[PDB]
Design a protein around this ligand. Structure first.
Ligand code: CLA
Ligand code: CLA
Ligand code: CLA
Ligand code: CLA
Ligand code: CLA
Ligand code: CLA
Ligand code: CLA
Ligand code: LHG
Ligand code: LHG
Ligand code: BCR
Ligand code: PQN
Ligand code: SF4
Lengths: 165, 143, 41, 741, 73, 219
C-alpha cells in the first residue's frame, strides 16, 4: 500500500478480471470439438492468460480501484516497498542499452571521420568496424565517464559554429 | 558613345494563329513591351504566351504584355537560335523607351562607362542595426 | 563477391537486416518470456 | 519500314559493381552524399530514366525490363495469394457452406496476444476474414480443391522466375533496339488479337470445359469432393452431354454454322443466377467468346509487313477539320517518341477502366456468392475506385511531364496540341466557372437544407417531401433498361442488373441485388460528384496547360516540371510548377473518391443490402438515406457517427486490428499536417541547433543533415494525408461491414 | 466548463502573443551595444543550447507519452 | 490517465515553447539567413535558393506555434471536460479506465458526448441544441476552409486570378465595368494568417459548440 493501492494478489477486481477473461475464452471454446486446432489454440491462449495473471499476482504489483497493475516511478518509494523493477531497474536497463547503441554510433562516427572519404563510409558501412565498435560499446558507461573526466568527450565552444546572433 | 536604335514601327510580325495570353487591358492604359530581332531563316519558335509561332526572314516584330516575356523570348532566341534582339518600352501616349541592351553590349559583359549604383562598399553583416534607424522609413541596407 | 558484400553493407540493406534481427530477437524474447510487465528479477 | 525483330547482343554486363555505388545512374548524384538531400534525390530519380540517359533506345530498354520486373512482382503476389488460399485458408469448408462461412485466407502467429485477430469465421477454422474475393473467383473458375490452388501458386512462382529472367535477358543479353519499340502497328495488332483476343478465347475455353460443369453441379447442390475433376470433364464429351446436351454432337454444328444448337451453354438471359446471386456462367462464356472474336477482328486493322491494313499516322493526319487547322498532325511522332505522353493516355484510360470495373461489379456481381458477402463487395468497389482515381491523377502528372520535357513546338505547329495551348485561358476560365457553379448548386443546397432544418423549416429544404429535385433523366434511363428485354432486347430473358427494376434477388436470406430508387439526395450527391470531378480536372488541366509557360512566369518550362517556386516575387510564385498542380489534384481526387465511396456505402446499406423475411426487405440502416443524405448533419450523424460505432467498440475482438488502424490512420493524417502547413526554413534552422548539439559532443554526421526540400515536404505531406485518410476509411468500412451485414 | 475553456484559450493566445512580441523586440528594439554582457546577450549567445534542449525535452515527451498511449491501445 | 494526460500537456507546452523561443532567438539571424534582422519581423521567405527558405521568419514561427497552442489547450480542455463529465455523472470510473488509452478518449468522450449535439436538428425535428449543432458544422467548415489556405500556396491562385481577369476584361456586357484595384492572389504571409485565423476560429467554435451542447443538454 504505497499510494492507496492494494496488491493484486489480494485485490478482488484482479481476480474478477481474470475470471472474466477466462470465461470469455471458454465461451469461445464452446463452439469447436475438443481436439481441433482452434481448440488447442484457445487452450494455449487460456494457459497464457492464467499464467500472466498468476505471475502478476506473484510479482507483487499494485492494483487500483479495479484490477489493473500500477507502476511506481519514484526511487525510495519503490526501493523500500520492493517495486524497483517497475521503473527503476528498467530505467537502468534502458540507460545501459541506449548508451551502448549511442556510444557505438558515436565511435563509428569518429572512426570514419578521420578516413579518406568519410562521406562514403556512412552509406557504405564498414561492417567489421561496426561489429567491433558495437562489441566495444558494451563498456559504454566507463568509457564515457573516462572520456568526460579526460575532457575529450565534449568540444570547445570556440570550435563550434553558431549563427551571428 | 552609343546611340539606341529607333523602333521601326512598320516591321513585320511572326506568323501566328492568335492566342489568349497576348495583350489585355493593361496595354491600353499603362504599358506594353515590344521586342525586335533579326532572323536569318523562316523557322518555328515558342511564344511566351503559349503556342508556336513562325518568325520570318529578316526583321521580326512582337509586342508583349510584360518585359519578362520579352526577355524570355530573347533568351530563348539567343540560346536555341543564336539571335540577338532589342526590347523597347512603349507608353500609350506615344513615347517609346529603349530597354534591355541599353549600352549596346549585354549586361553580363563589362562596358566601362556604366552606372555602378546600388553597390554597397560593406559586407552583409556591416549594415546598421534596426534599433539605430528606428522610426526612419528605410531598411538598414539603404543607408 | 566484394561488390555484392559492399551492396550488403549499404545503408538500406544493413538497416533492414538490423531491424529484422532486432525485431526477431524481441519477438522470440516475447515468445519465450511473454507478458513481462516489469523487470522482476 | 518492314516490321522485324532487331536486338543488340550483350549490351550491359551482368555483375554487382554498380550495386556497390548508389546514384550511378545519374551524373548529378556523383561525388558522394554531401547532404541528406542526396539520399532523398537518389530515391527521387531512380525511375526518371530521362535524367539518366538522353538516348530513347536505352530508356525504352529500361522501361521494358522494368515492366518485366513489375510482372514478376505481380506474379509473386499472385503466387502468395494462391499459396495462402491453399495452406492457410478455409476454402474447402467455405465451398460446402458459402452462405454462412466467412472467407478467410490469412492466419496469425500467437505472439503478443494477437491471436485474438484469428476470427471464428466458421468451418472449424480461425483466421483473418479476407475481403478480396479470391474465394468467389476460385469457385467461379471451378477449383473445389486444395491441391489445385497450390499447383497454381507454384505455377505463378515459375512465371515470376520467367518474368525476372526475361527482364534480365532483355536488358543484358538481347536488348531490343529503338525501332523495335516504335512498331506501334504491330504492337496494337498483337495486343488486340494475341493478348486480349486470345486471352478472352482461352478463358472462354476454360469456362466451357471447367467452370460450367463444376459450377453447374455446385448450383444443383453437390459436395465438391465427389464432383469430377476438371480434366475428366474436359477429357470426354459424355459427362458434358449429360450436363449440357449440345456436346453430344461435338464441333459439327460450329463448323456448319448451326450455332443455335449451342444455346444450352452459350446463352443470353441477363440478371443473376438465383442460386448464387452472380451472373450466369453460360452468359459469361458467350460474352468472352463474342469479345474474343471482336478483338481478333480488331487485331487486323493496322499495317505491318504486308500491304493490307491502315497506318496510324495516315488515319491521324487525315482527321483535320476547319475548326482545328492541321488536326492530328504531329500526334503520331509525339506518341512514338515520348514515353510520358503514352503513359498519360494509358494511365487515364486505365483509371477510367478501374472505375468502370468498380461500377459494373457492384451493379451486377459476376462471381457466385459475391453479392451476399457485402464486405468483399464494398471493399472491391472502394479499392477499384481509389486505384482509378490515383491512375487518373498520374495521367495528369505525366501529361504535364510530356508538356514540360518532350513537347517540341517545331513539329507541333497549328495542330490540336497547339490549338489547345493557344487558348488555354478560355478553357481554364470556363472550367473555373463550371466548378464555381457546381460548387454553389451542390454544396449550397446542402447548406440551405442544414439551415432550414436548424431553423425548424423542413418544408423549405430541398427534399423528396418538400422542394423536390428528382433525377428524371436517370430514372427514365432506369425505366428504359428495365423495359429493354422483350422490346429493345428481344433475346434477353432478363435485364442486365436488378438495379434498373424488377424483383429483389435474394440468396441465402440476404439480398443479392434489388432495384435502386433515385430521389433528391441522390440528385444532390451526383451533383457533388460532378463538382469534385470538375475541380480535380481543373487543377490537373491547369497544370498541364500552364506547365510550359504563363503570364506570371513566361519561362516555366526552363525551370522544369518539378520545381518548388520562382521566388517570393511577383507577389509570390509558390507552387507554380505542374508538379504542385498534381500535388493539389491528389487532395482533390482524395476528396472526390471519398465522397463517392461514402455515397456508395450509405446508399447500399440503406436501400440495397439487407435480409429478406418473406414479407419485405430489412436493410442494414433502414432506409435512412432518403431522409438524411440531403443534410450535412445527416452525413455526419446518420452515416459517419452511426456506422462508426462498429470500429470504436471493436477492441477485444477480431476487429481490434481495424480499430487500431482506425486511430493510427488518424495519426498519420494529422502527421501530414506538419509537412503541409510548415516550411523548410524553420526546420533547417532547428536542424542547425540540433547540429550544434551534435558538434558539442563530436557526434556530427559527415553527411550533412538538411531539412526536407520544399517539393520533398509537399510530397511527404500529401503522401501521409492520402495514406491516413484512405486507411481511416478502409478500417471504418471493413470493421463496419464485417461486424454487421 | 465554458468559463474554464474560455480562460484557457485566452491564456494560450495571450502567451503566444507574448512570445511573438518578444521576437519583435529582438527584431526591432534590441540593441547589442547597450545589451553587451548582460543576461539578454548571454541568453542570445548560447541560444543553440536552449533550442536543442527544448527539442530534446519535447522529443522525449512525445516519444514516451505516445508510446505508452499506443501500447495501452 | 491523469499522469498520461499531464505528460501530454507537458509535451504541448514544451513544443509550443520550443517553436516560440526558437523563433525569438533566431529572429535576428540564423545560419540559413544571417541578415534576418534587416528583413524585419514578418516576410514571406528568401526564395528557393540555399535549398529552400519557406517559413523562415519569426512571424512564421509564431504561426507554426499557434497550431501547437491550439492542440495543447485542446488537450487541456478535453482532459478537464472529460474528468468533470465523469464527476458530474458520479461515474469517475469512465475516465479512470478509459483515459489510459486513446480509443477510450475517442469513443467514451468524443463519440459518446456528441450524440445529443448532432441530434440538435434532424429529419424528425429540432430542439434547443440545434444552434450548437449548426455551430459544430460551422466550425468544421471554417477549419477546413483554413486548411485551404494552409495547404495550397500562392501561385496556382495567381494564375487562376490572371485567367479570370482575362475572362472579365473581354466578356461582353461586363466590359462596361472594371476593377479600380487590380485583383491579385493573397500574399504568402497574408494567406498564412488567413488560414491560421480560420483554423483558430473553427477550432474554437467547434469545441465551444460541443462543450456547451454536451453539458447543457445533459445537465
Ligand atoms: C525525479 C525527482 C524526484 C522526486 C519528485 C522525488 C520525490 C520523493 N521522494 Mg525521491 N529520489 C529521487 C528523486 C525524486 N524523488 C532520486 C533520483 C533518488 C535516488 C537518489 C531518490 C531517492 C529517494 C529515497 C531513498 C526516498 C525518496 C523519497 C521521496 C518522497 C518523499 C520526499 C520527502 O519526504 O519530502 C521532500 C524532501 C526534501 C529534501 C525536500 C517524494 C514523493 C522517500 C520516500 O520513499 O517516500 C516515502 C525516500 O525515503 N526518494
Ligand atoms: C548513433 C548516432 C546518434 C547519436 C550518438 C545521437 C545523439 C544525440 N542526439 Mg541524435 N539523431 C540521430 C543519431 C544520433 N543521435 C539520427 C540518425 C537522427 C535522425 C533521425 C537524429 C536526430 C536527432 C534529433 C532531432 C535530436 C537528436 C538529439 C540528440 C542528443 C540527445 C540525446 C538523444 O538520444 O536524442 C534522441 C536521438 C534520436 C531520436 C535519434 C536516434 C536514432 C538512432 C537510434 C540512432 C542511430 C543509430 C546508429 C545508426 C547506430 C550506428 C552503429 C555503428 C556501430 C555503425 C544526443 C547527444 C536531440 C538534441 O539535440 O538534444 C540536445 C534532438 O533534438 N537527434
Ligand atoms: C501475341 C503476341 C504478344 C502478347 C501475348 C504480348 C503480351 C504482353 N506484352 Mg507485348 N509485344 C508484342 C507481342 C505480344 N505481347 C510485339 C509483337 C511487340 C513489338 C511491337 C510487343 C512489345 C511490347 C512492349 C514494349 C511491352 C509489351 C508488354 C506486354 C505485356 C502487357 C502488360 C501485362 O501485364 O499484360 C498481362 C500479363 C500477362 C498476360 C501475363 C502473361 C505473360 C506471358 C509470358 C505472355 C507471353 C507472350 C509472349 C509474347 C510470348 C513470346 C515470348 C517467349 C519467348 C516466351 C503482355 C504480357 C509490356 C510489358 O509489360 O512488358 C513485359 C511492354 O512493355 N509488349
Ligand atoms: C504506370 C504508373 C506510373 C509510372 C510508370 C510512373 C513513372 C514515373 N513517375 Mg509517376 N505517378 C503515377 C504513376 C506512374 N508514374 C501516379 C498514379 C501518380 C499519382 C500519385 C504519379 C505522380 C507522379 C509525380 C508527382 C511524379 C511522378 C514522377 C515519375 C517519374 C519518376 C518516378 C521516380 O523515380 O520517383 C520516385 C519514386 C518513389 C520514391 C517511390 C515511392 C513513392 C511513394 C512514397 C510510394 C507510396 C507508398 C506506398 C503506397 C507504400 C505505403 C505503405 C508504407 C507505410 C510502407 C517516372 C518516370 C516524378 C517525375 O518527376 O516525373 C518525371 C514526379 O515527381 N509521378
Ligand atoms: C471545407 C473547406 C473548403 C471550402 C469551403 C472550399 C471551397 C472552394 N474551393 Mg477549396 N480546398 C480546400 C478546402 C475548401 N475549399 C482544401 C483543404 C484544399 C487543399 C487541398 C483546397 C484546394 C482548392 C483548390 C486547388 C481549388 C479550390 C477551389 C475552391 C472553390 C470552388 C468553387 C465552388 O466550390 O463554388 C462555390 C463555393 C462554395 C461551395 C464554398 C461555400 C459557399 C457557400 C456554400 C455558399 C455561399 C453563401 C455565403 C456563405 C453567403 C454570404 C454570407 C455573408 C455574411 C458573407 C471554392 C470556393 C478551386 C477554385 O479556385 O475554384 C474553382 C480550386 O481550384 N480549393
Ligand atoms: C495587448 C495585446 C496586443 C497588442 C497591443 C498588440 C499589438 C501589435 N501587434 Mg500583436 N499579438 C497579440 C497581442 C497584441 N498585439 C496576441 C495575443 C497575439 C497572438 C494571437 C499577437 C500576435 C501578433 C503577430 C504575429 C503580429 C502582431 C503584430 C502587432 C503590431 C501591429 C498590429 C497589426 O498587425 O495590425 C492590426 C492587427 C489586426 C487587424 C489583426 C488581424 C485580425 C485577426 C487576425 C482576424 C480576427 C478575425 C475574427 C476572430 C473573426 C471572428 C470569428 C467569427 C466571424 C466566427 C502591434 C504593435 C504584428 C507586428 O508586430 O508587425 C511586425 C505581427 O505580425 N501581433
Ligand atoms: C498528429 C500530428 C502531429 C504529430 C505527431 C507531430 C509531431 C511532432 N512535431 Mg508537429 N505540428 C503539427 C502536427 C504534428 N506534429 C502541425 C499541424 C503543426 C503546424 C504546422 C506542427 C508544427 C510543429 C513545429 C513547428 C514543430 C513540431 C515539432 C514536432 C516533433 C516534436 C517532438 C516530439 O514530440 O516527439 C514525438 C515523435 C513523434 C510523435 C513521431 C511518432 C513516432 C514514430 C511514429 C515512431 C517511428 C515508428 C516507425 C518506424 C514509423 C515509420 C513507419 C514506416 C517506416 C512504415 C514531433 C515529431 C517540433 C520539433 O521538431 O521538435 C524538435 C517543432 O519545432 N511540430
Ligand atoms: C537499495 C536497498 C533497497 C532494499 C530494500 C529492501 C526491501 C524489501 C526487499 C524486497 O522488496 O525484496 C527484494 C527486492 C525485489 O524483489 P521482488 O520483491 O521483486 O521479488 C519478488 C518477485 O520478483 C518474484 O516473484 O529487491 C529490492 O529490494 C530492490 C532491488 C535492489 C535494486 C538494485 C539496483 C542497484 C543499483
Ligand atoms: C462538346 C462540344 C461539341 C462541339 C464540338 O466539339 O464540335 C467539334 C468541333 C469541330 O472541330 P473540327 O470539325 O475541326 O474537328 C475535326 C478534326 O479536325 C479534329 O481534329 O471542334 C471544336 O470546335 C472544339 C471546340 C469545342 C468547344 C467546346 C465548348
Ligand atoms: C510551487 C509554489 C510556490 C513556489 C513558487 C515559485 C518558486 C515561483 C514561480 C514562478 C514562475 C517561474 C512563474 C513563471 C512563468 C513564467 C513565464 C510564463 C515565462 C515567460 C517569458 C516570456 C514569455 C518571454 C518573453 C520575451 C521574449 C520571448 C524575448 C524578449 C524578452 C521578452 C521577455 C519580451 C510557493 C511555495 C511559493 C507557493 C505554492 C506554489
Ligand atoms: C518535419 C518537417 C521537416 C523535417 C523532416 C525531416 C528532418 C525528415 C526526418 C526523416 C528522419 C531523418 C528519418 C526517420 C525515419 C523513420 C523511422 C521512418 C521514416 C519513413 C521512411 C522509411 C521513408 C522538413 O524538413 C520539412 C520541409 C518542408 C516542409 C515541411 C517540413 C516538415 O514538416
Ligand atoms: S515561401 Fe517557399 S515556396 Fe513560397 S516563394 Fe518563398 S521559398 Fe518559394
Amino acid at each position: 500500500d504505497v499510494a492507496g493501492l492494494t496488491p493484486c494478489s489480494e485485490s478482488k477486481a484482479f481476480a474478477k478480471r481474470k475470471k472474466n477473461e477466462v470465461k470469455a475464452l471458454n465461451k469461445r471454446l464452446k463452439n469447436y470439438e475438443a481436439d481441433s486446432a482452434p481448440a488447442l489454440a484457445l487452450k494455449a491462449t487460456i494457459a497464457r492468460t492464467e499464467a500472466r495473471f498468476d505471475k502478476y499476482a506473484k510479482q507483487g504489483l499494485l492494483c487500483g480501484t479495479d484490477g489493473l497493475p500500477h507502476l511506481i516511478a519514484d526511487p525510495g518509494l519503490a526501493l523500500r516497498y520492493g517495486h524497483a523493477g517497475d521503473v527503476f531497474i528498467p530505467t537502468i536497463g534502458f540507460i545501459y542499452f541506449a548508451g551502448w547503441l549511442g556510444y557505438a554510433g558515436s565511435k563509428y562516427l569518429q572512426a570514419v571521420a578521420a578516413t579518406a572519404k568519410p562521406i562514403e563510409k556512412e552509406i557504405i558501412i564498414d561492417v567489421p568496424l561496426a561489429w567491433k565498435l558495437l562489441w566495444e560499446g558494451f563498456g559504454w558507461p566507463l568509457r564515457a565517464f573516462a572520456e568526460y573526466k579526460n575532457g575529450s568527450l565534449m568540444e570547445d565552444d570556440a570550435k563550434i559554429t553558431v549563427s551571428p546572433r | 558613345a552609343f546611340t539606341p536604335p529607333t523602333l521601326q514601327s512598320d516591321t513585320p510580325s511572326p506568323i501566328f494563329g492568335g492566342s489568349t495570353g497576348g495583350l489585355l487591358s493593361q496595354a491600353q492604359v499603362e504599358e506594353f513591351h515590344v521586342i525586335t530581332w533579326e532572323s536569318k531563316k523562316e523557322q518555328i519558335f515558342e511564344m511566351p504566351t503559349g503556342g508556336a509561332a513562325i518568325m520570318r526572314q529578316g526583321p521580326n516584330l512582337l509586342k508583349l504584355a510584360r518585359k519578362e516575356q520579352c526577355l524570355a523570348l530573347l533568351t530563348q532566341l539567343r540560346t536555341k537560335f543564336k539571335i540577338d534582339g532589342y526590347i523597347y518600352r512603349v507608353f500609350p501616349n506615344g513615347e517609346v523607351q529603349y530597354l534591355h541592351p541599353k549600352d549596346g553590349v549585354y549586361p553580363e559583359k563589362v562596358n566601362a562607362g556604366r552606372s555602378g549604383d546600388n553597390t554597397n562598399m560593406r559586407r552583409i553583416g556591416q549594415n546598421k542595426e534596426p534599433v539605430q534607424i528606428k522610426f526612419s522609413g528605410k531598411i538598414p541596407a539603404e543607408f | 563477391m566484394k561488390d555484392f558484400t559492399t551492396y550488403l553493407s549499404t545503408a538500406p540493406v544493413l538497416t533492414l537486416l538490423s531491424v529484422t534481427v532486432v525485431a526477431g530477437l524481441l519477438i522470440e524474447i516475447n515468445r519465450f518470456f511473454p507478458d513481462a510487465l516489469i523487470a522482476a528479477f | 519500314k518492314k516490321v522485324k525483330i532487331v536486338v543488340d547482343r550483350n549490351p550491359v554486363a551482368t555483375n554487382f559493381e554498380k550495386w556497390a555505388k548508389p546514384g550511378h545512374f545519374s551524373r548529378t548524384l556523383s561525388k558522394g552524399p554531401t547532404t541528406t538531400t542526396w539520399i532523398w534525390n537518389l530515391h527521387a530519380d531512380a525511375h526518371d530514366f530521362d535524367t539518366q540517359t538522353s538516348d530513347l533506345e536505352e530508356i525504352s530498354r529500361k522501361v521494358f525490363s522494368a515492366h518485366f520486373g513489375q510482372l514478376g512482382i505481380i506474379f509473386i503476389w499472385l503466387s502468395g495469394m494462391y499459396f495462402h488460399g491453399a495452406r492457410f485458408s478455409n476454402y474447402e469448408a467455405w465451398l460446402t457452406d458459402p452462405t454462412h462461412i466467412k472467407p478467410s485466407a490469412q492466419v496469425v502467429w500467437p505472439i503478443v496476444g494477437q491471436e485474438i485477430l484469428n476470427a471464428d469465421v466458421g468451418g472449424g477454422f480461425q483466421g483473418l476474414q479476407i475481403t478480396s474475393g479470391f474465394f468467389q473467383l476460385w469457385r467461379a473458375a471451378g477449383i473445389t480443391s486444395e491441391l489445385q490452388l497450390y499447383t497454381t501458386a507454384i505455377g505463378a512462382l515459375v512465371m515470376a522466375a520467367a518474368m525476372f529472367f526475361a527482364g534480365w535477358f532483355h536488358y543484358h543479353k538481347a536488348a531490343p533496339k529503338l525501332e523495335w519499340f516504335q512498331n506501334v502497328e504491330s504492337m496494337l495488332n498483337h495486343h488486340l488479337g494475341g493478348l486480349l483476343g486470345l486471352g478472352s478465347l482461352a478463358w472462354a475455353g476454360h469456362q466451357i470445359h471447367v467452370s460450367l460443369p463444376i459450377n453447374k453441379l455446385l448450383d444443383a447442390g453437390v459436395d465438391p469432393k465427389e464432383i469430377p475433376l476438371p480434366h475428366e470433364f474436359t477429357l470426354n464429351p459424355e459427362l458434358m452431354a449429360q450436363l449440357y446436351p449440345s456436346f453430344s454432337k461435338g464441333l459439327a454444328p460450329f463448323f456448319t454454322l448451326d450455332w443455335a444448337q449451342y444455346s444450352d451453354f452459350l446463352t443470353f438471359q441477363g440478371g443473376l443466377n438465383p442460386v448464387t446471386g452472380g451472373l450466369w456462367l453460360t452468359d459469361t462464356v458467350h460474352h468472352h467468346l463474342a469479345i474474343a472474336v471482336l478483338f481478333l477482328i480488331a487485331g487486323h486493322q493496322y499495317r505491318t509487313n504486308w500491304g493490307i491494313g491502315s497506318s496510324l499516322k495516315e488515319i491521324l493526319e487525315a482527321h483535320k477539320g476547319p475548326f482545328t487547322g492541321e488536326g492530328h498532325k504531329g500526334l503520331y511522332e509525339i506518341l512514338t517518341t515520348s514515353w510520358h505522353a503514352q503513359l498519360a493516355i494509358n494511365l487515364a484510360l486505365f483509371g477510367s477502366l478501374s472505375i468502370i470495373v468498380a461500377h459494373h461489379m457492384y451493379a451486377m456481381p459476376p462471381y457466385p456468392y459475391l453479392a451476399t458477402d457485402y464486405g468483399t463487395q464494398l471493399s472491391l468497389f472502394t479499392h477499384h475506385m481509389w486505384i482509378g482515381g490515383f491512375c487518373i491523377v498520374g495521367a495528369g502528372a505525366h501529361a504535364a511531364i510530356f508538356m514540360v520535357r518532350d513537347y517540341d513546338p517545331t513539329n507541333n505547329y497549328n495542330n490540336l496540341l497547339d490549338r489547345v495551348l493557344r487558348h488555354r485561358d478560355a478553357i481554364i476560365s470556363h472550367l473555373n466557372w463550371v466548378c464555381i457553379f457546381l460548387g454553389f448548386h451542390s454544396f449550397g443546397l446542402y447548406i440551405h437544407n442544414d439551415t432550414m432544418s436548424a431553423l425548424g423549416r423542413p418544408q423549405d429544404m430541398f427534399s423528396d417531401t418538400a422542394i423536390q429535385l428528382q433525377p428524371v433523366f436517370a430514372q427514365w434511363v432506369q425505366n428504359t433498361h428495365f423495359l429493354a428485354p422483350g422490346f429493345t432486347a428481344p433475346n434477353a430473358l432478363a435485364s442486365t442488373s436488378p438495379s434498373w427494376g424488377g424483383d429483389v434477388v435474394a440468396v441465402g436470406g440476404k439480398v443479392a441485388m434489388m432495384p435502386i430508387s433515385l430521389g433528391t439526395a441522390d440528385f444532390l450527391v451526383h451533383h457533388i460528384h460532378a463538382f469534385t470531378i470538375h475541380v480535380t480536372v481543373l487543377i490537373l488541366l491547369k497544370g498541364v496547360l500552364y506547365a510550359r509557360s504563363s503570364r506570371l512566369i513566361p519561362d516555366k518550362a526552363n525551370l522544369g516540371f518539378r520545381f518548388p517556386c520562382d521566388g517570393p516575387g511577383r507577389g509570390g510564385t509558390c507552387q507554380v510548377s505542374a508538379w504542385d498542380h498534381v500535388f493539389l489534384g491528389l487532395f482533390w481526387m482524395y476528396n472526390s473518391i471519398s465522397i463517392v465511396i461514402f455515397h456508395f456505402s450509405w446508399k447500399m446499406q440503406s436501400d440495397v443490402w439487407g435480409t429478406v423475411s418473406a414479407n419485405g426487405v430489412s436493410h442494414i440502416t433502414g432506409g435512412n438515406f432518403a431522409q438524411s443524405a440531403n443534410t450535412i448533419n445527416g452525413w455526419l450523424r446518420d452515416f459517419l457517427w452511426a456506422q462508426s460505432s462498429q470500429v470504436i467498440q471493436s477492441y477485444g475482438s477480431a476487429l481490434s486490428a481495424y480499430g487500431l488502424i482506425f486511430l493510427g490512420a488518424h495519426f498519420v493524417w494529422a502527421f501530414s499536417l506538419m509537412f503541409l502547413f510548415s516550411g523548410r526554413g524553420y526546420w533547417q534552422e532547428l536542424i542547425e541547433s540540433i547540429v550544434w548539439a551534435h558538434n558539442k559532443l563530436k557526434v556530427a554526421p559527415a553527411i550533412q543533415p538538411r531539412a526536407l526540400s520544399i517539393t520533398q515536404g509537399r510530397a511527404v505531406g500529401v503522401a501521409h494525408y492520402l495514406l491516413g485518410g484512405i486507411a481511416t476509411t478502409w478500417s471504418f468500412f471493413l470493421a463496419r461491414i464485417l461486424a454487421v451485414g | 466548463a465554458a468559463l474554464y475553456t474560455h480562460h484557457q484559450y485566452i491564456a494560450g493566445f495571450i502567451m503566444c502573443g507574448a512570445f511573438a512580441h518578444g521576437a519583435i523586440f529582438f527584431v526591432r528594439d534590441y540593441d547589442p551595444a547597450q545589451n553587451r554582457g548582460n543576461v539578454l546577450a548571454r541568453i542570445l549567445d548560447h541560444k543553440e543550447a536552449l533550442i536543442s534542449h527544448l527539442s530534446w525535452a519535447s522529443l522525449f515527451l512525445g516519444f514516451h507519452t505516445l508510446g505508452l498511449y499506443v501500447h495501452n491501445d | 490517465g491523469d499522469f498520461l494526460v499531464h505528460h501530454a500537456i507537458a509535451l504541448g507546452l514544451h513544443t509550443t515553447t520550443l517553436i516560440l523561443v526558437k523563433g525569438a532567438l533566431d529572429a535576428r539571424g540564423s545560419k540559413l539567413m544571417p541578415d534576418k534582422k534587416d528583413f524585419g519581423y514578418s516576410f514571406p521567405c528568401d526564395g528557393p535558393g540555399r535549398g529552400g527558405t519557406c517559413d523562415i521568419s519569426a512571424w512564421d514561427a509564431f504561426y507554426l506555434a499557434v497550431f501547437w497552442m491550439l492542440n495543447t489547450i485542446g488537450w487541456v480542455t478535453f482532459y478537464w471536460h472529460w474528468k468533470h463529465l465523469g464527476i458530474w455523472q458520479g461515474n469517475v470510473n469512465q475516465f479512470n479506465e478509459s483515459s489510459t488509452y486513446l480509443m477510450g478518449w475517442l469513443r467514451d468522450y468524443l463519440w459518446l458526448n456528441s450524440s445529443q449535439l448532432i441530434n440538435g436538428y434532424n429529419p424528425f425535428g429540432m430542439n434547443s441544441l440545434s444552434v450548437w449543432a449548426w455551430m459544430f458544422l460551422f466550425g468544421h467548415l471554417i477549419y477546413a476552409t483554413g486548411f485551404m489556405f494552409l495547404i495550397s500556396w500562392r501561385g496556382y491562385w495567381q494564375e487562376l486570378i490572371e485567367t479570370l481577369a482575362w475572362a472579365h476584361e473581354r466578356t461582353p456586357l461586363a466590359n462596361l465595368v472594371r476593377w479600380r484595384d487590380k485583383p491579385v492572389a493573397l500574399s504568402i504571409v497574408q494567406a498564412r494568417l488567413v488560414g491560421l485565423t480560420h483554423f483558430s476560429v473553427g477550432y474554437v467554435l467547434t469545441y465551444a459548440a460541443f462543450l456547451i451542447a454536451s453539458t447543457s443538454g445533459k445537465f
